Write a protein that binds this ligand. Structure first.
Ligand SMILES: [Cl-]
Ligand SMILES: [Cl-]
Ligand SMILES: [Cl-]
Length: 236
């Protein structure tokens, strides 16, 4: 395992503001692209502030479709739920997060990411592969609104892999007023061989706001997000 002498482990690494670096390499129907992101996370408040840039030119998919792929260790876990925080418990060695995201009546993304500390920086390194998309559909045809809605993300233990399974749905807004469903199937597994916290069933409550940097001429996304764990509740 880790050196114990190690000063901070698991949740101890998140008591303050932590710098975040995100790196994504993607290929959707052979459209290749890369995204980098930077900012900070303050788990005490469940607060994420991040700016992402497409480093290869124009992003060939809508930015909103990448939000879930682009650090659940920054969730605010209530003190009364702290024993259910898998994500921080896996740190600093980290965890692998894998998803399949099914876009209804369109293609799918498959993603694999490793989330771990490199010194003081929490790093999310991702590979994304998309296939079976319609060239003129809502994704490759860029028919989605640049916005986001609030969601619950449902977490349960996966004892076989010493990890968790996560499931949720995102409904992106199409420019004609309709909805593009993106059904998310997710699993996380620790990278290290030490103990992790395997949670009871619960959820994370997300709020997300997308904006633009008026001084940024590259294709980019500014993201402000708040994340709180809930769903496990006589004192009063
Ligand atoms: Cl976009
Ligand atoms: Cl997150
Ligand atoms: Cl928004």
């Amino acid at each position: 395992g880790i050196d114990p002498f190690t000063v901070s482990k698991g949740e101890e690494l998140f008591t303050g503001v932590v710098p975040i670096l995100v790196e994504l390499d993607g290929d959707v129907n052979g459209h290749k692209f890369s995204v980098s992101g930077e900012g900070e996370g303050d788990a005490t408040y469940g607060k994420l502030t991040l700016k992402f840039i497409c480093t290869t030119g124009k992003l060939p998919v809508p930015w909103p479709t990448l939000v879930t792929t682009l650090v659940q260790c920054f969730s605010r876990y209530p003190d009364h739920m702290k024993q259910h925080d898998f994500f921080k418990s896996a740190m600093p060695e980290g965890y692998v997060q894998e998803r399949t995201i099914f876009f209804k009546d369109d293609g799918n993304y498959k993603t694999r990411a490793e989330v771990k500390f490199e010194g003081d920086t929490l790093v999310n390194r991702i590979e994304l592969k998309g296939i079976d998309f319609k060239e003129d559909g809502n994704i490759l045809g860029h028919k989605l609104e640049y916005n986001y809605n609030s969601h619950n993300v449902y977490i349960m233990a996966d004892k076989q892999k010493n990890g968790i399974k996560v499931n949720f749905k995102i409904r992106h807004n199409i420019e004609d007023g309709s909805v593009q469903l993106a059904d998310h199937y997710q699993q996380n597994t620790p990278i290290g061989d030490g103990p992790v916290l395997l949670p009871d069933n619960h959820y994370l409550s997300y709020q997300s706001a997308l904006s633009k940097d008026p001084n940024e001429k590259r294709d980019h996304m500014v993201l402000l997000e708040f994340v709180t764990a809930a769903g496990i509740t006589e004192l009063y």
